[PDB]
Amino acid sequence: RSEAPPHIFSISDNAYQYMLTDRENQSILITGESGAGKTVNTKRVIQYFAVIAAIGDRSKKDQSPGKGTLEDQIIQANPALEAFGNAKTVRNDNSSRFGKFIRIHFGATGKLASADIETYLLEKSRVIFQLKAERDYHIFYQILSNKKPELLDMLLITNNPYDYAFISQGETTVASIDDAEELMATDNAFDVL
Amino acid sequence: IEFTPEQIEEFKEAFMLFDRTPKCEMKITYGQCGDVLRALGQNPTQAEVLRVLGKPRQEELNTKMMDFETFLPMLQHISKNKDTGTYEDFVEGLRVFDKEGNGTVMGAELRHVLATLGERLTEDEVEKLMAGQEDSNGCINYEAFVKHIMSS
Amino acid sequence: KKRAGGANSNVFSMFEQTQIQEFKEAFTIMDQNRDGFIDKNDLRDTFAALGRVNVKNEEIDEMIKEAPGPINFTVFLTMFGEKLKGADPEETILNAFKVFDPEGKGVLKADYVREMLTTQAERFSKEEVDQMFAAFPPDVTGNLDYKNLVHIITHGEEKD
Amino acid sequence: KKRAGGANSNVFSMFEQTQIQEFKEAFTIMDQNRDGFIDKNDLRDTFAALGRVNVKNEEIDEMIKEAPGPINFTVFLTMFGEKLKGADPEETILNAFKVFDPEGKGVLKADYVREMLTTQAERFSKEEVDQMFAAFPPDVTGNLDYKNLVHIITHGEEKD
Amino acid sequence: PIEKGKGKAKKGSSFQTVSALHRENLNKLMTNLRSTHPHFVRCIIPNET
Amino acid sequence: PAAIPEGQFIDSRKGAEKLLSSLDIDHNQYKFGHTKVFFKAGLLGLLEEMRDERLSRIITRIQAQSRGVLARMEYKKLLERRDSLLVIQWNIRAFMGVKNWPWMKLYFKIKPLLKSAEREKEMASMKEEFTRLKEALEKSEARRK
Amino acid sequence: VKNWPWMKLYFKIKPLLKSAEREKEMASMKEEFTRLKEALEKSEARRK
């Protein structure tokens, strides 16, 4: 660690390097306020693990997806949880409207073993009518825009928009993302699960 | 110093083996200079190998070829080295791990020391070094370990 | 004879309970001296209907190089061992191209074979290449030399 | 001349492993006076070594007539070589009561066999049936089919 | 058995009482968290906008 | 190697300070503990890379002996190449003929039908094959077992 | 065919030879060689 400076990979480097050797159980606690990019940060902690410690073939220069599928599934579950769990608040387009605790597991020799995640609360209250400029759970908008004319029948979506009554205010946007293509990505993340 | 009739045969055999060609030519690569000398019995670092390289090439394949005329003035030089190592250096060395006077070594702590500093071994070579059998949570011992290394 | 001792060989025993039994079964189609002989004059007769090709006065004793004389019941064993021995079998014949691959279950890299054929020491001629081209068994992006040789062993046909 | 091959061979169990061999090697004991040419007397003596009578001269004389004459090491073997048809292979007879039904391994009732041989096919006689019947390992109303099949065919009865 | 004010465990029925369910798990997370090595990142916010 | 002799053995603790202080290592920016050792940012890392350039002798001699262990057994590849390579030529000069040969296929179909095929040699092997497999199955049960 | 000229020469004198000799013994013995090897394959990998 001199080539390993003060970016989140380091703390996670030092935690892993430390733990596999000492065998005592550990933690990673990030605090902050409303939109203190918490969720984006922890995925970086995981992105250290998911590509360093585990048995992933590095010896080729490919963008990467080079195994192992434990690492691939552990990653995808996070976006999956974000689509369902995250909505949007006046401060934060990506307001994880819930809470999760993650116990990462490691094996005998080096590499990853699994993860135990529990959940605290969820904003089920909002579903009726949201206050100001918020959006309801991401999973919805994704299903509306990306779904094909076939699924539209069975699934029973409105063809037209602004029909949906549980969506207060209107159809609020997020800066720089779509609603549509994010659907196909995560749906594949289910196949990957 | 100069090579005896027995030593010349040792050098000739290994060199003739190294000539890998459909039509033959009688040459070795500078990269192959590593394991040649090793098979010859002299135990060198890659630092020792490159030290006798005609080309300031480092590791790669497809740089320079050396004849037997060139290879022998390499071998003749190599023979001079004295510091090869014994057993008891390694005993003194490996004892440092201890905390309670057991001379016992956990598997993870043992694999990591192999990988980290020096010319280094890989993840793969560690898998080869330890493939069992039937001791959990999960200890090796320093005495039997070193003696098997030297035993070959 | 110690240098006649090269690679390629395997050794068996005299008795056979019911293993080489097969020769008693086959006998009738081929036989010469029914006592139990195939002699110097029978190669010039039977092999004409056993081989895809031909014998010339140039390669006489060479075409018989393995068995130039009295192949008795005692001797048949060391023509069979000579199946595993022959003209550099298996250990050389097969391993020759097999040794090429840097990493594992390979196949000889076609275009580079064409390269060496016209370059490495004795520059060959176009005739051999074109006959070879139509006769190349390229299983997907590399010349399967291993089978191009090993077709004559394995166990999964019976024609010739 | 490379268009004169001998291709294709093994159908079933031609020279059956337990019949063929032990005959060719035996030849030295049949060939009495050691010429290779078995006369009617070379037979005459060897069958005397076997058991008590032996077929008459005419009965051996017809066997000599089956061959083109000089029963020697060439002819005797070749006259044997072609003759494969007659008996059925072991597995074929053996599977008869095994394929008795879709399910599924108990024992086959001797009443069903008695009802079949008499009636469904070539109508065997009262004599033919009960004769072949009598020698049967009848483990309680059902036949030990494979063993009776062994009684039909196995290593056993000389001197023929 | 369900003795109510809730729920199922914990405990019996009043549709919800989730705040009590947030007592049970709260003990289970915390006491163990004391016994685990702390790693921390104290993320601060630059603007409201 | 100047300060700590090894082989006839030193204290569990007292050995570390020289193995630290060899390449100097600034005093404040390291700390001793019981099992876990503590370091600061900066000072540690690059001094830890430098230990590749510096750690000759025993460290690299263990790895080197392992290199010699490996290489003595598993160099292969180039070994049988030269002899085969010459022979490849001995064939290449006659490729137009090759396909017209002797040993092809006549030796096969019967083999699935026959009973106790490879007898005599396996007969010589029989007893040792019987005994050792049981001798193994004795140990190769009992444990997990 | 219980009265033919050239066939049922089998046991009465012929087993002065070999051939038949070992067969049945090996049938009883080969059973043991297989099962010991089969278990020897599967066992260790089960304990893994």
Residue numbers in the entry:
A (entry chain B): 147 to 339
B (entry chain D): 44 to 195
C (entry chain F), D (entry chain E): 7 to 166
E (entry chain B): 630 to 678
F (entry chain B): 727 to 871
G (entry chain A): 824 to 871
How did the manuscript describe this experimental structure?
Myosin heads comprise a motor domain (MD) that hydrolyses ATP, a regulatory domain (RD) that includes the essential (ELC) and regulatory (RLC) light chains, and a proximal S2 subfragment. During relaxation, two myosin heads pack together to form an interacting-heads motif (IHM; [Woodhead et al., 2005]). The IHM appears to form through key interactions involving the actin-binding region of one myosin head (denoted as ‘blocked’) and the converter region of the partner ‘free’ head. The blocked myosin head has a pre-powerstroke state while docked onto its S2, so ATPase activity is sterically inhibited, and the actin-binding interface is positioned on the converter domain of the free head, so that it cannot bind actin.
